[PDB]
Every structure is written in C-alpha cells, then in structure tokens.
Amino acid sequence: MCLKLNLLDHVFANPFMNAAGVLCSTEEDLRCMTASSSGALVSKSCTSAPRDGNPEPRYMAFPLGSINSMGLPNLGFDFYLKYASDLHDYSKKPLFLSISGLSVEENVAMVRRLAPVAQEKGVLLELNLSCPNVPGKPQVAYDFEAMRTYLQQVSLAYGLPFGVKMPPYFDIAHFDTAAAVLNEFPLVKFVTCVNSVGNGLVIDAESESVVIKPKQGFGGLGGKYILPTALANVNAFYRRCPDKLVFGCGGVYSGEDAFLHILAGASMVQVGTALQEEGPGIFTRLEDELLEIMARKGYRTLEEFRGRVKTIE
Amino acid sequence: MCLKLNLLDHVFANPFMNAAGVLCSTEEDLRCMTASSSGALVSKSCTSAPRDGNPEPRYMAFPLGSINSMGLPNLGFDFYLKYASDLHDYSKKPLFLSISGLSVEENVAMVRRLAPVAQEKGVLLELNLSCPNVPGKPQVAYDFEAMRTYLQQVSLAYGLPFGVKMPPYFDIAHFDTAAAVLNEFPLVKFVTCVNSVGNGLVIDAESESVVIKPKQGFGGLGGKYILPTALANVNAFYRRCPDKLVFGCGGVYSGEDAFLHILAGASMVQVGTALQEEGPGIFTRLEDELLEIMARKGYRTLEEFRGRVKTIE
Numbered sequence A, B: 001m002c003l004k005l006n007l008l009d010h011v012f013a014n015p016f017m018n019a020a021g022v023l024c025s026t027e028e029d030l031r032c033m034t035a036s037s038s039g040a041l042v043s044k045s046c047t048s049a050p051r052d053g054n055p056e057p058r059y060m061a062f063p064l065g066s067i068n069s070m071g072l073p074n075l076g077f078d079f080y081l082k083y084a085s086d087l088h089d090y091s092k093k094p095l096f097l098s099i100s101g102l103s104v105e106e107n108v109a110m111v112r113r114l115a116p117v118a119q120e121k122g123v124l125l126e127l128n129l130s131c132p133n134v135p136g137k138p139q140v141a142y143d144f145e146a147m148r149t150y151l152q153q154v155s156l157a158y159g160l161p162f163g164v165k166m167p168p169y170f171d172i173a174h175f176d177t178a179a180a181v182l183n184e185f186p187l188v189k190f191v192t193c194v195n196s197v198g199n200g201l202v203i204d205a206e207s208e209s210v211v212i213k214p215k216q217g218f219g220g221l222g223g224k225y226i227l228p229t230a231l232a233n234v235n236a237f238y239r240r241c242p243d244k245l246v247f248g249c250g251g252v253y254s255g256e257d258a259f260l261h262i263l264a265g266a267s268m269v270q271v272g273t274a275l276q277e278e279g280p281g282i283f284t285r286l287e288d289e290l291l292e293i294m295a296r297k298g299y300r301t302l303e304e305f306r307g308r309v310k311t312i313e
Ligand SMILES: Cc1cc2nc3c(=O)[nH]c(=O)nc-3n(C[C@H](O)[C@H](O)[C@H](O)COP(=O)(O)O)c2cc1C
Pocket: A019, A020, A021, A022, A044, A045, A059, A066, A068, A070, A072, A098, A128, A165, A194, A195, A196, A221, A222, A223, A224, A226, A249, A250, A251, A252, A270, A271, A272, A273, A274, A276
C-alpha cells in the first residue's frame, strides 16, 4: 500500500502539498518543500513586481487556527518564473505556480510569460481569484461578472490547462452560480477549495487588543475553525463540476481530516496553518495517518472512496 | 460592580439571552428561559402558519460546535403573539419576538399585528433576514436590494423601533454595503450579528457519512467554529452604525467569550449552541465568569469596556 496518483498528466507520490502562501515564499522555502515528503508544492501567489506586504504582526496562530492579513509579500513573478524554469527539480515532485495580479492586465501579462515554461517544464498554474477588484466591489471571486472576465482573459492569454483557487461560499445559490461560471471554461481543470475564511477578528482578552496590526485586526481565518466550511465547498464543487478536479484546502491537521476532504471529493489535499505550525515533518505524519485509516477500513486506493461521502436517505 | 443595562427603553439585569431558535420554540421552552437567570429571551423565528420543519436528524453538536438545517419548525405567529400579549411575565425580564416570513407580504402582515402588542406590552421585534428569498436566490440579507425592500416595507408597516438578525459577511465591501442599507432605516435600532455560518458540511469519518439529513448534509454552523467570524461582524457593524446598538451572537461558551463580544461592541450577548448543549444553567456560570474578569481588570460596568477593543497603532 502506497498513496501515489496521477493527474493533470503528472505523477504524485501522495496527495499532500502545502497551501499557497505557507512555506513557499523564498528559494529556501521552496527547496525545503521540495525536500519534504509532500507529493507536490505551490509557490506563494505573486505579483509582477515584488511586495513587502503589510506591517507586522500580520499572522497569528492559536489552538483552533490562524488569522492573517499578510498583504501578499512576495519576491515577484520574475523570481517564481526563474524558480520554475531553472531551479526546481521536477524529478522530485510537480510544481504549481500561483499568481494573483492586482488587475486583469497584470494577470494576462504574467500568464503569457508563464505559458512557454509550462510547455517546456510542466509547471502548473493556480490562479488566485481572491484578488483585488475595481472600486466598491468585493474580491474578484465574489463578483461573478469579474470572475467570468478574468477567466476569459486568462484562458485566451494562457491557452493551457490551469486551476483556480476559490474563496469559500456560504449560500447554495452562490455555489450554483460560481460553479456555472467555472464550467464555462474548459481550460480550468482543477478548482481548489478553499482560501481563508475572509475578515474574521481575533481579540486577546488579557490585553483587550486585536492580535494582528493591519486592517484594525481583521484577516483571513484558517485551521480548525474552517474545516466544515472547507468540506462544504469541496463537495459543492465536486458535485457541480464533474469534468474538473477539486483540490481540498482548509483545516487539515491529521490524516483523518485529509480522509474527510477526499471523501468530500478532493484529489489533492493542501495544508496551510498546520504546516505553518508544525513544519514540513507534518507530511510524513499525514501520509502515515491516512494510510492507517485506509488499512483499518480495507481501502487500497484513494479512488475507492474519493467523493463517496454518504448522505442520509 | 454590575451587569445591568438599560436600552431600547427596557432594563436588563445582565446582557445574556438565548439565541433565536434555541430553547424558545414552545410555551414550555419560553417559560424555562423566563425562569432562567438570562437578562432576556427571544422566541423562535416564526412564520404565519405553523411548520414541522425538516426531517431528522437536523441538528448535531460536536466539541467545536454545531450544524443545523432545522427548516424553521415553529408553532406559528398566533402562538408567539399570544405568548407575548397574554402569557409572558414582563416583570421577570424583557421579551424579543423573532419573525422570519417567506415573503415581504407575510412579514408585513405579521408586523402589522405585532405592533399594538409591542406598544402595549413592550415586546421587541427581531426580524430575521436570513429568510429564503425566491428559491435560487441567496438568502434575503445576501441580496441587498431585497433586503432594502423588506426593511422599507417592514418599517412602514410596523412604525416602531425594531432590530434585525444578520448573517455573517466575509468581505469588507459587504460590510460596507450592508451597513449602508441598515443606516437607511432609522427604526432599525439594533443589529444582531450573527446568524449561523451558512452551508457548512460535517462529515463523520467512521461512518463516511454526513451527520444531518436535509440538504445532503449541508447546514449552518454555530459554536467555537464561528467566534472570530462573529466578533468581526459585531465590530464591523459597531464601527459602521453609530446610531444603532449591536447585539453579539456566535461562539459564546464562557464569560471570556462574552467579554470579547462586548469589547467588539456588543450590548446584548446571545448564546445558541452552548445553551443547546449545556442547558439554562449556563446563564449563572456566564454571569459569574464575566464578573470575575471585570473584577480582575477593575471594571465596574459594561460601558467601561463596550466597544473599546484596541488596535495595534
Ligand atoms: C500566512 C498565510 C499566507 C497565505 N498566502 C496565500 C497566498 O499567497 N495565496 C493563496 O491562494 N492563499 C493563501 N493563503 C491561504 C491558504 O493557502 C489556505 O487557503 C488557508 O490558510 C486555509 O487552509 P488552512 O486551513 O490549512 O490554513 C495563505 C494563508 C496563510 C495562513
């Protein structure tokens, strides 16, 4: 019994990888992720130009999860592109490169340059749709008309299979609408569910203060707080997008959590907050735990239970 | 040192009450909440006609919280109106009556008949804007033009101060819009943040099954899952609605959680999942734990720290 799988025409030793933004910003981080037992890795979402990001403290963690308003600190697209092109060892595992431009034009300019490296090396694009929008408007993935424009422009500019990172939704009509938009794009072959649960607020009772500095303490939530939300989105998309893959992300701390995501429909399982907290050693433990649950259940393959969550009557 | 508050022309011994839907369906429930040490009570959100609600299991609870898709089982408006006009003992504590009609007109007919009882007995209206829209559209409070319509018509029809129960939002543009809408209506004197976090999905690893029956296992989340989300919404609306009160609801299990809510801006503090799980004895413990925190910090009243959460710079 081993967890290897094949998707998007790549081979993966197991279904685990980091979540975009965790342990993937610098060359040192990417080498450390490559050296881990993860099945794959994804680089920090990038902009055309480097960014310092928001003032610190900008990330904090707690027993039940984490909050962040990092502000997209990153080395810039030229760095991640050079990483994909010249530095990454594709014999070790596949690489996803995440992009999140400030505008549709910025996104188009980066994907045009990425396309030739994706052909030459097999680096895979994850487009981060939790990106800023026009004035007055929510993030792009919560504005379905902007999301349709961005995906049209990117599909045309890029021309190759890619995936999208989605924020969580909380209403069934939204699931219906969001999946219908994504289903208009045959190049979108995977959907990752979910990004951080937006704009929560952690307050420390002793100091009577918020715990991160930007945005008056508001920031995205990850970890145990968000698992049932993450499983919902995974399963909603799995059901509505039968010709695409779904990657789960949200609240993975154990092989059991991972098991649940795969039952919900996940092909790959991303780890954010728990990886931030525990370090890359976590991938050996998650593999071991997930194999142990499978043995106890008599499952030999992931395919045997992926997406087979049971409903009641 | 005291928990007393005076608001909306009523006097409350302390800020605690049940969350709508918990321990408030039946005359027996309402008499039990009345008997409790809560500073107030609210009745189950009602429709004109009684409802059986969804098939069971439709609520489950776990260490970090709860999921429900109850389908608004309730005894009908005539019953809650009779409880408010003839049965409730107002010398014990104040009463909120929650309504959630399936259309603007069903809300209008109910508030027209509540008005004289509100004037004569002092019952306070909480309008639950998480009611379904036309199916296939999101819930009313996630459709800002529908929410506006409902509030115009209910304001005209009722003509007395009332409050609104809001779902959580996750995007600053949403906070901005939702508050602007509410700020159009001077009779909306209190905003309760938040209802359950919509359409999560709990999966049981052993059985490989969702844990509630309706909606293929999708339901609203409460409890520890949702505290930072609830704090964010309380503070967002506190900061955007300076002429309105904010009541806090979500994730309260302790006097410390109540303290955080209050710091965020909460006036009243509602207790759902933890009350469902622990029973009405929770109110004495909450009061004792909140008083202990206040004593240790030197606070004598709630207004000394309400809304005084600190930001960093
Ligand atoms: C410090 C930090 C930085 C992140 N940066 C990104 C990013 O650059 N792009 C992105 O798509 N998601 C980003 N995320 C979101 C995660 O990729 C993931 O969607 C989220 O944390 C929920 O997964 P978790 O519960 O395992 O944390 C970030 C998360 C954290 C905690």
